[PDB]
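Subject: Interface between my chains keeps coming out wrong

I've been trying for a while to get a sensible model of this assembly. When I model each chain on its own everything looks fine, but I need the whole thing in one frame so I can look at the contacts. Pasting all components below, labels as-is. Any help appreciated, I'm running out of ideas.
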Amino acid sequence: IIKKELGLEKDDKDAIEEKFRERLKELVVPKHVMDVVDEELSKLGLLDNHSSEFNVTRNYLD
Amino acid sequence: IIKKELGLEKDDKDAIEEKFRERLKELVVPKHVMDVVDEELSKLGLLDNHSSEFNVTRNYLD
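Reply #2:
Try treating it as a single job with all components included. I did that and got this:
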């Protein structure tokens, strides 16, 4: 029932998370940077795009 | 309500607090620095996420 909640096709995710994950998929990525980027992405998803900190975090990710 | 039952749950309670609590739990650490970090955590929670001072406080706590 948690899953069965406002399907709406789940459109416009922007796959920025997945985009960066794939970009790093090919490279041999150390664990340290892995956890660092996981924390950064958790923060970013936990921030709205309007926030300037959101843009700063996205630049850090890039 | 996806935030409800974990999910994102951003801004419900400073996520850094419990993370650093468990990070410091194992360490044998002097008396005053507990109250120091408690003060820092109270400030961080009272500081908005977007504010640059909040990020500086998080960096100092790191």
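Reply #3:
Confirming on my end. Helices of chain B lie at 15-25, 31-46, 52-61.
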